[PDB]
Amino acid sequence: LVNFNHIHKRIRRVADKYLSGLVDKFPHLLWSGTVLKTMLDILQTLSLSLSADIHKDQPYYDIPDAPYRITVPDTYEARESIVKDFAARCGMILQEAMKWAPTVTKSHLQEYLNKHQNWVSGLSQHTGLAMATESILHFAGYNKQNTTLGAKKDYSNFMASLNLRNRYAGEVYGMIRFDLNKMMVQDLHSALDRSHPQHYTQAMFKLTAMLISSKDCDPQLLHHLCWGPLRMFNEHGMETALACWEWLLAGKDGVEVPFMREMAGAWHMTVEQKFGLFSAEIKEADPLAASEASQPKPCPPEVTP
Amino acid sequence: EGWPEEWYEGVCEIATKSPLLTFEPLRSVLTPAELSELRSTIINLLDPPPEVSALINKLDFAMSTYLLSVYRLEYMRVLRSTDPDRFQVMFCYFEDKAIQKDKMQCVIAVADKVFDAFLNMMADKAKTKENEEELERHAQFLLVNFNHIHKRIRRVADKYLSGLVDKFPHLLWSGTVLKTMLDILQTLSLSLSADIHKDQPYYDIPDAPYRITVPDTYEARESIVKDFAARCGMILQEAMKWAPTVTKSHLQEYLNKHQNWVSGLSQHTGLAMATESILHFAGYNKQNTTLGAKKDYSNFMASLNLRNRYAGEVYGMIRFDLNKMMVQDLHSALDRSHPQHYTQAMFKLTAMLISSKDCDPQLLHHLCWGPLRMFNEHGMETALACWEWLLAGKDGVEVPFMREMAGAWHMTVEQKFGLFSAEIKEADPLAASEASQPKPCPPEVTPHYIWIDFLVQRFEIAKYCSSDQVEIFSSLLQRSMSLNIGGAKGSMNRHVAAIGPRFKLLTLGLSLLHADVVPNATIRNVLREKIYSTAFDYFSCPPKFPTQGEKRLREDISIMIKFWTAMFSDKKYLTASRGSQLHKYYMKRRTLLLSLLATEIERLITWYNPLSAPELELDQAGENSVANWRSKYISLSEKQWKDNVNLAWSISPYLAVQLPARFKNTEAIGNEVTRLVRLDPGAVSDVPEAIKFLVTWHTIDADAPELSHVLCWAPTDP
């Protein structure tokens, strides 16, 4: 990517051809978690360099979080042309990624917009954030309710997830100023015993926010996180657990295997206990000889979660 | 009305407490000349469309007298009533089943008449806070009846809402209408699919005592929700067009409630509507606001993220007084001069303040006195964000905040910390052979360029609703200016690089004057005199050239052109009370100021780009007007121009001396200036230009050796 904006003519063409071939033969690089950040950073660098007193020397720039450098031409017209040309591949790759796997790329975009460094400069242009918040809109799809109909658009999930994530991250960071896992476990147990949904969600989000900012796995916290919803089987707790699991997967790195193992164990326990689809079968009286006080009535099993 | 006056007067209180004329068949309950006369009188009183008149023409005496009696009763009740439910009682007559079954347009006609009378009544009631509350409640009430089960009820409600929003434009950016309408939209969306065969079609609107009924079939419900889904976008775009900042802040505040977050994983159509309407009504930011042939969303996201994050952070601490810690942290951050700690402390302090039950004046005072110790643009941006959040968050706090801001502004004016700083002189190149080489020393005023914009936005917001903030703005504007046009006393810097904020403040003052708010005819005279006096001050120095770059110059020209037009639009005189004396006294100075401003604008735009440069362009109407004025005033004869020199001398000798510098292609100005300076040489003591108007009594004639006392002038160039 960094050689796509070389000062020469044929170098960028051959780099574009190589990039097209590489992305053609390896489709899974589109939804990776590092390409998008780097390309947004280089786009922001070019946008900042658009107006930087051409007569002033030192056209070099340093890309943050990656050792590289970028040179720019002298005239304004060439710089505007190159930035406008580069501003199209971003949208192309973003729409290509959004077409196939929307959930992972949407979660990555949500995670990108939660860095403290960019918030101060957000009052200025900061073209990367604008590009992200513009590309989020016109590539969305239908939700569960309106996915199968014969002849609407949904954005509430994005905003709700972002707001909850930022709010609870701030709340958990505020407490650390003044061990502490015991308090979280006790609060979760009390909420489960009292059967209260609001405290359930608050404890779940606080626990996952505390876990996401640490240096150790702390297996007891993960085990209690996985064994959480099974004691409050419903759809609201299931939605909260899915949101927390998605945040945990998108936040930390090198944690997929233990989480998958714990989820598989919980699934096997659920299968064994006959708590859901695997429940027992109940018979009902036949109407031909149901003159007794045991009148017939449907008894269908319910499996929402 | 028309017999003791007590007889007519006594009917008013009787009608005040009289019950409604409600009601079984109606007709069962109940001389052509007199019938014709009463029909003529009632048709003259009503003046309806001809169909209603045709319907009336076939009515006997009973229905006509019933209509007349009810019209009189309702008119008297609405005119002399005092209850807060004045005009909404008329819908009670619409819900009667007996009246509907009768073989009706008269009722809606008299409703239109009484609504027009009520609307006319409130147009000049007062400008206090309670009238705003009454109007807000009426507007909220009208919305809930837009989805009535009947047919004509929603039509008349829509017409009334359109009229009310037409005559009171300020209700668009109110802070309660949007929440209620979003809530009712969400209620309808939820009720869209609710098992039609199940009973109880009623619903309760949260945070407002009302109820909504829905039809039976799916098609009618879908049609009504789709129809209602358009007025939302219409009013949202109308509000966004005029005042984007306040409505954007309100939308940001709405999306920060805990109740909706849990259900946000579902549809929750209100949040989707808000986050869809935010996009395609945005505008350009400061960088890309004035260019000749981009879109901005970073501010919204940054503000929302910072607000939520710091609200959560401040809420987390309260689990385990505390204002002392915040004050100490802010003081330490200011002393150490660290920006990150500065912003963190500011946001934490405002988040703590926004969630309390008392004003706590020390916290507000420290919040206002914050940026003045770290004068820059980053702290100014942080302070503006915090002030906007504080204003949008709490209610009933505007007045103390405005007072504290005015006090801080006055202190800044006094301390000479910004635009009001002192003037620094530099060595002249003719005799600068010393080690003190010449170099530009321009004052820098970045932060003062945004505070004026904030003041303009607040004044535009508060022009209609309040009546006390106008006095605060007038007091603030009066104490910054002074009528001391002269040498080195004007309380304002005279450098070229500081012409933006000066003329922006002048334009704000002119806009305040044109707002027609000050009742008396004496404050306006003093304010206008000060405006003109401080406008004439800038032209008392030798001309020079701008030192800033290519940017930060176009908007200055735009501001100058806008101010020139606003100055041109004062033919509003002739009623300031011998008015002719003051009229001509103002007209002459207006003409002179317009000429000087036109010359300055022409010079600056000439300096902008040397070549013609057809690609670059500015506003066309202003340039055409300037060219027309130049063509008009360039044709003056030898007379009516020497008289101008006398007026300039009467204003101030320095302005008269600096007149030929602004070149005029006529030699009479020099002769008149020489004659005036010969008549009185002691009034001027500025050597670099005035000395040559007195020294040469005659170039080569070598006569008249008198009155030449040059033993007092300051040294000049070798």
Short mmCIF file of C-alpha atoms in Angstrom, two decimals, chain A:
data_model
loop_
_atom_site.label_atom_id
_atom_site.label_comp_id
_atom_site.label_asym_id
_atom_site.label_seq_id
_atom_site.Cartn_x
_atom_site.Cartn_y
_atom_site.Cartn_z
CA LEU A 1 0.00 0.00 0.00
CA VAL A 2 2.74 2.49 0.91
CA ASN A 3 4.27 2.18 -2.58
CA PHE A 4 0.96 2.95 -4.32
CA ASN A 5 1.79 6.68 -4.09
CA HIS A 6 5.35 6.63 -5.41
CA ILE A 7 6.73 9.73 -7.12
CA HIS A 8 7.42 7.87 -10.38
CA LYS A 9 4.89 6.76 -13.02
CA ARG A 10 5.21 3.02 -13.72
CA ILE A 11 6.06 2.10 -10.11
CA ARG A 12 2.54 2.86 -8.88
CA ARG A 13 1.03 1.02 -11.87
CA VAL A 14 2.98 -2.17 -11.20
CA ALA A 15 2.26 -1.84 -7.46
CA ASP A 16 -1.46 -1.55 -8.23
CA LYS A 17 -1.32 -4.64 -10.45
CA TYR A 18 0.50 -6.62 -7.75
CA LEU A 19 -1.99 -5.49 -5.10
CA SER A 20 -4.92 -6.48 -7.32
CA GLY A 21 -3.43 -9.92 -7.92
CA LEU A 22 -2.65 -10.47 -4.23
CA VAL A 23 -6.14 -9.44 -3.11
CA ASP A 24 -7.59 -11.62 -5.88
CA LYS A 25 -5.82 -14.81 -4.81
CA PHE A 26 -6.28 -14.22 -1.04
CA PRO A 27 -9.80 -12.87 -0.44
CA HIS A 28 -9.54 -13.13 3.36
CA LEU A 29 -7.24 -10.10 3.66
CA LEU A 30 -10.20 -7.73 3.16
CA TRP A 31 -11.59 -8.21 6.68
CA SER A 32 -8.19 -8.16 8.40
CA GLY A 33 -7.70 -5.96 11.45
CA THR A 34 -4.54 -4.07 10.44
CA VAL A 35 -4.91 -3.08 6.78
CA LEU A 36 -7.80 -0.69 7.42
CA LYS A 37 -6.00 1.21 10.18
CA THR A 38 -2.83 1.64 8.12
CA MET A 39 -4.69 2.80 5.01
CA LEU A 40 -6.79 5.26 7.02
CA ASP A 41 -3.61 6.59 8.63
CA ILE A 42 -1.88 7.13 5.28
CA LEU A 43 -5.02 8.79 3.90
CA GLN A 44 -5.06 11.15 6.89
CA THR A 45 -1.36 11.87 6.38
CA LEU A 46 -1.95 12.78 2.73
CA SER A 47 -4.95 14.95 3.64
CA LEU A 48 -2.85 16.81 6.22
CA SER A 49 -0.01 17.20 3.70
CA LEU A 50 -2.44 18.62 1.12
CA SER A 51 -1.87 22.21 2.36
CA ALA A 52 1.55 22.51 4.02
CA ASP A 53 3.22 25.61 2.50
CA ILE A 54 4.66 24.06 -0.67
CA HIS A 55 7.62 26.47 -0.69
CA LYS A 56 8.64 25.16 2.75
CA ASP A 57 11.13 22.31 2.43
CA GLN A 58 11.09 18.75 3.85
CA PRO A 59 8.26 17.06 1.90
CA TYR A 60 8.91 13.85 3.85
CA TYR A 61 6.39 12.47 6.34
CA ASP A 62 6.39 9.58 8.82
CA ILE A 63 3.46 7.15 9.00
CA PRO A 64 2.52 6.48 12.64
CA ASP A 65 2.72 2.93 14.01
CA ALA A 66 4.73 1.78 10.97
CA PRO A 67 8.31 2.57 9.89
CA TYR A 68 7.97 4.17 6.44
CA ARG A 69 8.06 7.53 4.69
CA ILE A 70 6.07 9.30 1.98
CA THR A 71 7.22 11.94 -0.51
CA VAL A 72 4.88 14.41 -2.20
CA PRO A 73 5.13 16.44 -5.44
CA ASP A 74 5.70 20.20 -5.61
CA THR A 75 2.65 21.70 -7.34
CA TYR A 76 -0.77 21.76 -5.70
CA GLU A 77 -2.48 20.21 -8.74
CA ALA A 78 -0.44 17.00 -8.64
CA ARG A 79 -1.04 16.57 -4.90
CA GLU A 80 -4.79 17.13 -5.31
CA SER A 81 -4.89 14.69 -8.23
CA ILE A 82 -3.02 11.95 -6.35
CA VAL A 83 -5.13 12.31 -3.19
CA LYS A 84 -8.35 12.25 -5.25
CA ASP A 85 -7.12 9.16 -7.11
CA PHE A 86 -6.26 7.40 -3.84
CA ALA A 87 -9.65 8.34 -2.35
CA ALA A 88 -11.40 5.71 -4.53
CA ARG A 89 -9.60 2.47 -3.64
CA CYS A 90 -10.62 3.07 -0.02
CA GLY A 91 -14.31 3.06 -0.87
CA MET A 92 -13.89 0.13 -3.25
CA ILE A 93 -12.19 -2.12 -0.70
CA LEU A 94 -14.56 -0.99 2.06
CA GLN A 95 -17.66 -1.89 0.04
CA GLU A 96 -16.09 -5.19 -1.04
CA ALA A 97 -15.40 -6.08 2.60
CA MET A 98 -18.86 -4.96 3.72
CA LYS A 99 -20.59 -7.04 1.03
CA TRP A 100 -19.48 -10.45 2.35
CA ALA A 101 -18.86 -10.27 6.13
CA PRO A 102 -20.51 -7.16 7.61
CA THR A 103 -20.31 -8.06 11.30
CA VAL A 104 -16.53 -8.35 11.67
CA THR A 105 -15.70 -5.24 9.64
CA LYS A 106 -18.41 -3.26 11.45
CA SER A 107 -16.97 -4.32 14.81
CA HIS A 108 -13.48 -3.33 13.64
CA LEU A 109 -14.76 0.08 12.52
CA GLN A 110 -16.44 0.53 15.91
CA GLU A 111 -13.18 -0.36 17.66
CA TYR A 112 -11.15 2.05 15.51
CA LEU A 113 -13.25 5.08 16.53
CA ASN A 114 -12.40 4.68 20.25
CA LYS A 115 -8.86 6.06 20.50
CA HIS A 116 -8.01 9.04 22.70
CA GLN A 117 -5.43 10.60 20.36
CA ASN A 118 -7.88 11.38 17.56
CA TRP A 119 -10.58 12.83 19.84
CA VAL A 120 -8.64 16.05 20.51
CA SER A 121 -8.13 16.71 16.80
CA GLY A 122 -11.66 15.57 15.94
CA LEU A 123 -12.80 19.19 16.15
CA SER A 124 -10.67 19.69 13.02
CA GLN A 125 -11.11 17.82 9.72
CA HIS A 126 -9.37 14.52 10.57
CA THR A 127 -10.43 12.97 7.29
CA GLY A 128 -10.10 9.35 8.46
CA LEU A 129 -12.98 9.57 10.93
CA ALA A 130 -15.14 11.34 8.34
CA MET A 131 -14.35 8.63 5.79
CA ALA A 132 -15.30 5.89 8.25
CA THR A 133 -18.53 7.57 9.38
CA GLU A 134 -19.46 8.18 5.73
CA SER A 135 -18.71 4.62 4.60
CA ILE A 136 -20.74 3.12 7.45
CA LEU A 137 -24.01 4.46 6.01
CA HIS A 138 -24.66 3.41 2.41
CA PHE A 139 -23.44 -0.20 2.74
CA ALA A 140 -25.72 -1.37 5.57
CA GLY A 141 -28.24 -4.19 5.29
CA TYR A 142 -31.57 -5.32 6.67
CA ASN A 143 -31.95 -6.63 10.21
CA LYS A 144 -33.64 -9.82 11.42
CA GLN A 145 -37.18 -8.41 11.30
CA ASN A 146 -37.01 -7.19 7.67
CA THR A 147 -34.65 -9.76 6.13
CA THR A 148 -37.25 -11.93 4.31
CA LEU A 149 -40.12 -9.99 2.73
CA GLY A 150 -41.56 -9.56 -0.74
CA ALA A 151 -42.07 -6.10 -2.23
CA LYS A 152 -36.26 -0.92 6.81
CA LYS A 153 -32.61 0.11 6.90
CA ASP A 154 -31.00 -0.33 10.30
CA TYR A 155 -28.45 1.74 12.22
CA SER A 156 -29.56 1.46 15.87
CA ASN A 157 -27.27 -1.48 16.66
CA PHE A 158 -24.14 0.45 15.67
CA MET A 159 -24.96 3.48 17.82
CA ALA A 160 -26.11 1.40 20.79
CA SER A 161 -22.99 -0.78 20.74
CA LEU A 162 -20.66 2.22 20.45
CA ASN A 163 -22.40 4.13 23.25
CA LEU A 164 -22.48 1.15 25.62
CA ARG A 165 -18.84 0.29 24.90
CA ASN A 166 -17.52 3.81 25.50
CA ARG A 167 -19.72 4.44 28.54
CA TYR A 168 -18.78 1.23 30.34
CA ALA A 169 -15.10 1.54 29.41
CA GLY A 170 -15.09 4.98 31.02
CA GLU A 171 -17.01 3.71 34.05
CA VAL A 172 -14.60 0.82 34.63
CA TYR A 173 -11.59 3.11 34.15
CA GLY A 174 -12.94 5.56 36.72
CA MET A 175 -12.99 2.96 39.50
CA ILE A 176 -9.35 1.88 39.12
CA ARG A 177 -8.09 5.12 40.71
CA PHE A 178 -8.94 3.93 44.22
CA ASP A 179 -8.78 -7.32 45.17
CA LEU A 180 -11.44 -6.15 42.71
CA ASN A 181 -12.49 -9.29 40.81
CA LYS A 182 -14.26 -10.52 43.96
CA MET A 183 -16.54 -7.47 43.90
CA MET A 184 -17.50 -8.12 40.27
CA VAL A 185 -18.17 -11.81 40.92
CA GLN A 186 -20.27 -11.03 44.00
CA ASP A 187 -22.28 -8.41 42.11
CA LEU A 188 -22.93 -10.83 39.24
CA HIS A 189 -24.01 -13.58 41.65
CA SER A 190 -26.32 -11.21 43.52
CA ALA A 191 -27.87 -9.98 40.27
CA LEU A 192 -28.44 -13.54 39.06
CA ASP A 193 -29.96 -14.62 42.38
CA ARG A 194 -32.26 -11.58 42.53
CA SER A 195 -33.21 -12.03 38.83
CA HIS A 196 -32.87 -8.41 37.75
CA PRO A 197 -32.11 -7.60 34.09
CA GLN A 198 -30.59 -4.12 34.48
CA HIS A 199 -28.09 -5.22 37.12
CA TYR A 200 -27.38 -8.31 35.01
CA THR A 201 -26.43 -6.21 31.98
CA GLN A 202 -24.46 -3.69 34.05
CA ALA A 203 -22.45 -6.44 35.77
CA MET A 204 -21.79 -8.25 32.48
CA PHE A 205 -20.55 -5.11 30.72
CA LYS A 206 -18.46 -4.02 33.72
CA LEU A 207 -16.87 -7.47 33.97
CA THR A 208 -15.98 -7.64 30.28
CA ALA A 209 -14.65 -4.06 30.32
CA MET A 210 -12.47 -4.89 33.32
CA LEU A 211 -11.22 -8.07 31.64
CA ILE A 212 -10.40 -6.37 28.33
CA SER A 213 -7.89 -4.07 30.10
CA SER A 214 -5.41 -6.37 31.84
CA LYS A 215 -2.23 -8.38 31.30
CA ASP A 216 -3.37 -11.90 32.26
CA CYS A 217 -6.11 -14.28 31.17
CA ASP A 218 -7.54 -14.67 34.71
CA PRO A 219 -9.35 -17.93 33.85
CA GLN A 220 -11.95 -17.62 36.62
CA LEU A 221 -13.35 -14.42 35.10
CA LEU A 222 -13.66 -16.02 31.66
CA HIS A 223 -15.25 -19.14 33.15
CA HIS A 224 -17.84 -17.06 35.03
CA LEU A 225 -18.46 -15.03 31.86
CA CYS A 226 -19.22 -18.19 29.88
CA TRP A 227 -21.35 -19.76 32.63
CA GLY A 228 -23.40 -16.57 32.94
CA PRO A 229 -26.36 -16.80 30.54
CA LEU A 230 -27.10 -20.46 31.34
CA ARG A 231 -28.65 -19.44 34.69
CA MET A 232 -30.93 -16.80 33.09
CA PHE A 233 -32.03 -18.57 29.90
CA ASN A 234 -33.91 -16.03 27.75
CA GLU A 235 -33.37 -13.75 24.74
CA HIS A 236 -32.38 -10.51 26.51
CA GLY A 237 -29.50 -12.14 28.38
CA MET A 238 -28.54 -13.95 25.18
CA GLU A 239 -28.34 -10.65 23.28
CA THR A 240 -26.26 -9.09 26.05
CA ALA A 241 -23.93 -12.10 26.08
CA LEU A 242 -23.54 -11.99 22.29
CA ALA A 243 -22.65 -8.29 22.42
CA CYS A 244 -20.11 -8.91 25.20
CA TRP A 245 -18.58 -11.85 23.32
CA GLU A 246 -18.26 -9.79 20.14
CA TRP A 247 -16.59 -6.95 22.06
CA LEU A 248 -14.20 -9.37 23.77
CA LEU A 249 -13.23 -11.01 20.47
CA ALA A 250 -12.74 -7.67 18.71
CA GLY A 251 -10.80 -6.07 21.57
CA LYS A 252 -7.99 -8.39 22.66
CA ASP A 253 -5.62 -10.49 20.55
CA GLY A 254 -4.53 -14.09 20.99
CA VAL A 255 -7.55 -15.15 23.06
CA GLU A 256 -9.75 -17.03 20.57
CA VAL A 257 -8.81 -20.61 21.51
CA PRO A 258 -9.68 -20.57 25.26
CA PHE A 259 -12.92 -18.70 24.54
CA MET A 260 -13.89 -21.29 21.92
CA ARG A 261 -13.06 -24.13 24.31
CA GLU A 262 -15.14 -22.62 27.12
CA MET A 263 -18.06 -21.95 24.76
CA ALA A 264 -17.91 -25.55 23.53
CA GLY A 265 -17.93 -26.81 27.12
CA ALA A 266 -20.94 -24.65 27.97
CA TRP A 267 -22.74 -25.87 24.84
CA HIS A 268 -22.06 -29.50 25.78
CA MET A 269 -23.37 -28.91 29.31
CA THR A 270 -26.52 -27.32 27.87
CA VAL A 271 -26.96 -30.32 25.56
CA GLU A 272 -26.59 -32.70 28.51
CA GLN A 273 -28.97 -30.91 30.88
CA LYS A 274 -31.95 -30.98 28.44
CA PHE A 275 -32.52 -27.25 28.94
CA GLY A 276 -33.57 -26.27 25.41
CA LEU A 277 -34.16 -28.00 22.08
CA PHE A 278 -32.83 -31.17 23.75
CA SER A 279 -35.66 -31.18 26.30
CA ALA A 280 -37.95 -34.13 26.97
CA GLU A 281 -41.20 -34.76 25.09
CA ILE A 282 -44.60 -34.22 26.71
CA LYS A 283 -47.72 -36.12 25.63
CA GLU A 284 -51.30 -34.84 25.70
CA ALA A 285 -54.71 -36.46 25.96
CA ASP A 286 -56.55 -37.48 22.78
CA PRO A 287 -59.87 -35.72 22.11
CA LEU A 288 -61.72 -38.99 21.47
CA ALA A 289 -61.59 -39.98 25.17
CA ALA A 290 -60.86 -36.67 26.90
CA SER A 291 -64.19 -36.26 28.70
CA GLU A 292 -62.29 -35.89 32.00
CA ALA A 293 -61.29 -32.58 33.59
CA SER A 294 -57.97 -32.95 31.72
CA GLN A 295 -59.10 -31.11 28.61
CA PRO A 296 -56.70 -31.15 25.65
CA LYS A 297 -54.50 -28.12 25.01
CA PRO A 298 -51.34 -27.54 22.94
CA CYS A 299 -48.03 -27.86 24.80
CA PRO A 300 -45.35 -26.77 22.33
CA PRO A 301 -41.71 -26.40 23.39
CA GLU A 302 -40.30 -22.88 23.12
CA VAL A 303 -36.74 -22.40 21.83
CA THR A 304 -36.00 -18.71 21.29
CA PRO A 305 -32.35 -18.45 22.47
#
